Symmetry: C3
Subunit: 256 residues, 3 copies
């Protein structure tokens, strides 16, 4: 026997009749124990039983009651704790070190130690993983990611939400490379060691890994792994031979 | 009468003739008051007047002058403040608790209290909302989101920018579920209680909610809400009957 | 002569024969120096030599050895440092100020000073840039971005990963505008001063800037820059005249 489910079920049906202030402590204690059990994994909102996923509605009700029963409170940075084996790049950097490096680090942007950012780089809130190199004058916009070992050239614009995929393995593969003077538009993804050559304009919504067809609409040639210099690329599709569907492709629409 | 607009207008026309160092204090004070008014909402860069949106160019000029007139300075974590009713999962976790749980929490990753992560999970900078369960060996890549009550299986790879949508209401609906051994590629989105069954490979750029057609190109069947086990899924489109447009669809291109 | 490459090469071949505990200090010192050189840019994983990008495999091996040779440790918020010229909005806000403003700021959400959030706004972990205005009751979901000067209306839902693009220059251009009662679905992007008019439903995966065709499938009209009020918009494609490819377009599929 466990009374948690029944107590939470009853309180949720009764929820219009109490508030956070006058909540009886047994309901309050039951909600806490439900939250603690969700937190240590001894309870879970849904689980697979006899081959089928089953939802436990009373645990959803516990989550909802925990919102009802707790007021907003100040939360400080000290309440965030982490645990990892790679140091962050700027811990214990002085103001002199920051000024000498010439990089703007907009909170809450983080770079890992073992990555490099040249002078006049701006890191909006974003992530730069270990082994990456970001050259002079480059803008890394909000929630962008410069993945492990990626090489970002000079005067590059990585727009918001852009992901530059990391490459460690295989050891012989080139990392993902964005050459000088490229524009990568919002929520685009360049991964798996693809190279975008110099002076290209990649619009928003463009996904390119090693399997993406890069269709030059002027020549008809399908390229892989490399955007030729000066390409303007937008998202598109290529038709199937039967005409019943089409598949995503990156379309080179002009060469500038 | 307010002189803010005129002072900011004049200073911006005159901006090549002063710097942050020798800026006269009246310009400096006007810029500050403009920023304070934008911050408390008594001023706004654009507003709807007589049914039309109007831009206030002098407030854009104030924002630009605030960049010119202030140097970069160290900003610490203590300068970030929050305000919410749900505790974060790891506040006051000891090193012993971190080691016992076996989860790597890469800064600045945050999970809410009332979510669970099994041993050998790696949280790159990412978010795990309340009620979610992330099973053993799973990787949550940078700027991914595990939404409320979602169930992530064992040895799952959530790539960068992947969103697993939360499900609280309706109470009877299954949460979004990623079964064991799935790969979800970058900037893909699995939402609204969709289940991705075991061993599937979802490429980057795949969006699946309850309204997304999942087209099995081999059988011609259109599925909803569920990716069958072992599916390889990529973004595509399906043509309209008139052939004038096509609509986004997730394409099952092979079964592995 | 430098022995770093040889030491790292040898240790990596020998890696199954030592651990972090009993690693000889020369290997440990070589790995550290490799990491320091990657961090200050004097070493880089790949570089362009005689017109071709070359990978330095021993630097990848150094990165991998740095994982092997260091255990996870607690990392605190104090180890994150930033450097920027714009203050964050809430630093030194009291509990009274937070309660009076009526905005939930879910860690690690950050807004810049000079942006406004009305009562009953919820900022999930997200970013609100300077000059933006977020009206009453609006939800900004996880890893969304409200860009500079953007105007978000009342009772708007910005879903996870949504980017609302910033607009400062040109001075005369309207910022990006989301009117009252709009739903913007996950990982969608509204940029470049586009306006989404009141009561529209934008599905996930919708990208709209000034160059995106907004195709009204009922009338056949192609709109730019503006989503008419009450539109339901989903991602699609429009066919080329030769039928060899199609290009991304936002499809108005009904008017509600
Ligand atoms: Ca602190």
């Amino acid at each position: 026997m466990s009374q948690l489910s029944t107590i939470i079920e009853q309180a949720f049906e009764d929820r219009a009749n109490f508030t956070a202030a006058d909540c009886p402590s047994e309901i309050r204690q039951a909600v806490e124990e439900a939250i603690a059990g969700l937190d240590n994994g001894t309870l879970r909102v849904a689980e697979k039983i006899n081959g089928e996923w089953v939802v436990h509605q009373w645990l959803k009700k516990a989550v909802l009651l925990s919102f009802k029963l707790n007021d907003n409170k100040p939360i400080e940075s000290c309440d965030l704790r982490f645990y990892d084996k790679v140091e962050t790049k700027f811990s214990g950097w002085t103001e002199e070190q920051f000024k000498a490096a010439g990089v703007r680090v907009v909170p809450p942007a983080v770079a890992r130690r073992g990555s490099f950012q040249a002078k006049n780089v701006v890191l909006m809130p974003s992530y730069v993983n270990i082994g990456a190199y970001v050259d002079e004058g480059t803008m890394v916009d909000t929630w962008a990611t410069v993945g492990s070992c990626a090489q970002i050239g000079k005067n590059v614009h990585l727009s918001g939400g852009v992901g530059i995929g990391g490459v460690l393995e295989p050891l012989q593969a080139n990392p993902t490379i964005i050459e000088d003077n490229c524009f990568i538009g919002a929520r685009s993804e360049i991964v798996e060691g693809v190279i975008v050559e110099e002076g290209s304009v990649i619009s928003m919504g463009v996904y390119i890994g090693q399997s993406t067809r890069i269709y030059d609409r002027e020549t008809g040639e399908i390229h892989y792994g490399r955007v030729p210099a000066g390409s303007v690329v937008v998202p598109g599709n290529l038709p199937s031979a039967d005409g019943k569907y089409s598949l995503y492709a990156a379309i080179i629409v002009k060469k500038v």
